[PDB]
């Protein structure tokens, strides 16, 4: 039975190939005591977060703390899935443009620390494309730590045309803390950030027309919503509901010069071969938790329509389970009979070394 593990900057999604949903979802963190176990992993750190210093081993989609990542994987196999890794082929995920040395190290750790019988490393955006049933299209994957626009042709990501945006869900939570603080409610601490993440996920949305929506917010209180904190205390949120994810379209809101996600989509397509551009426009797939904002697909449709040739068929696909589409795509892929020839086997690793990840994945 094959395993699928999507290693997020924010959340680990893990489970078995062939299942519709990840069996286990837990925070990508390792925590250590602030004052006199030596460490706590994932949900175990979450449950004791108040007394621990938290560290994220994955930054902007790239593994940067290998010792802590090994703890994450150990916890995934033994605590979460309750499996013996030497008994299961394992599919891992990686960010677009993940350095070769990173993927070699991942491969080495899997074969040599966990003794997996076989493994494979797949690109997150590609798995989401597959989950939607396509092998050609352009994927916008906005997660907790990074946002990528990834044009894909017949299963192949087109590296020259990939766009990376270091603006994603965590930055948006931080921005919401800031503007709620300006509103009159102080959100400044580490625990308060989690509260504001929940507010963001509950109440934020993307305006179809930002200027019009701001006008409405100023003219009446119908866009206002109350939010009850865990202790019963209540706050109100007004135009911050849509100003927060507006940052995706206007990165200058947090002082970045970068183009917004609509422009990065357009720029990405325009870097691709002329004959595949219309196929990308017709197959724009959203993925990741930060694409969950109500209104986002219609706003993307609008902005891209304005940028594209006026007769271009534009289509935005935003699947309901797109928080987990990377994992779901991996589940589908690993369970295809036609995929069984793709795995990197232990025998193949032993004779070739970690560099075999370049040839097989």
């Amino acid at each position: 039975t094959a395993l699928v593990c999507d290693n997020g900057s924010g959340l680990v999604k893990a489970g078995f190939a062939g299942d519709d949903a990840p069996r286990a979802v837990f925070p990508s963190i390792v925590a250590r005591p602030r004052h006199q176990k030596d460490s706590y992993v994932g949900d175990e750190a979450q449950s004791k977060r108040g007394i621990l210093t938290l560290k994220y081993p994955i930054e902007h989609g790239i593994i940067t703390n290998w010792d802590d990542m090994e703890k994450i994987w150990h916890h995934t196999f033994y605590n979460e899935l309750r499996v013996a890794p030497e008994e299961h082929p394992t599919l891992l995920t990686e960010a677009p443009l993940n350095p070769k040395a990173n993927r070699e190290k991942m491969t080495q750790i899997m074969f040599e620390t966990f003794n997996v019988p076989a493994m494979y490393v797949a690109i997150q955006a590609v798995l989401s494309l597959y989950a939607s049933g396509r092998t050609t299209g352009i994927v916008l994957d906005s997660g907790d730590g990074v946002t990528h626009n990834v044009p894909i042709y017949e299963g192949y990501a087109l590296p020259h045309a990939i766009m990376r945006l270091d603006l994603a869900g965590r930055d948006l939570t931080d921005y919401l803390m800031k503007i709620l603080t300006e509103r009159g409610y102080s959100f400044v601490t580490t625990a308060e950030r989690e509260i504001v993440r929940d507010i963001k996920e509950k109440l934020c949305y993307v305006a179809l027309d930002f200027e019009n929506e701001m006008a409405t917010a100023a003219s009446s209180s119908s866009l206002e919503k109350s939010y009850e904190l865990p202790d019963g205390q209540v706050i109100t949120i007004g135009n911050e509901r849509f100003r927060c994810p507006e940052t995706l379209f206007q990165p200058s809101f947090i002082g970045m010069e970068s183009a917004g996600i609509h422009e990065t989509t357009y720029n990405s397509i325009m870097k691709c071969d002329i004959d595949i551009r219309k196929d990308l426009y017709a197959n724009n797939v959203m993925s990741g938790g930060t694409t969950m904002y109500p209104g986002i697909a219609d706003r993307m449709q609008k902005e891209i329509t304005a940028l594209a040739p006026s007769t271009m068929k534009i289509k935005i696909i935003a699947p309901p389970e797109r928080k987990y589409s990377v994992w779901i795509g991996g589940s589908i892929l690993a369970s295809l009979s036609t995929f069984q020839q793709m795995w990197i086997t232990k025998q193949e690793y032993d004779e070739a070394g970690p560099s075999i990840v370049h040839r097989k994945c």
């Binding site: 597959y130 049933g133 092998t135 299963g155 192949y156 295809l336 036609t338």
Partner: peptide, 24 residues
């Protein structure tokens, strides 16, 4: 599921892709 498998089975090679200028 059935839909994805076919396109994956007919997935052209890294070489055959460079030929059409699509893949570097």
């Amino acid at each position: 599921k059935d839909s994805l498998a076919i396109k994956l089975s007919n997935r052209p090679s890294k070489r055959e892709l460079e030929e059409k200028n699509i893949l570097p």
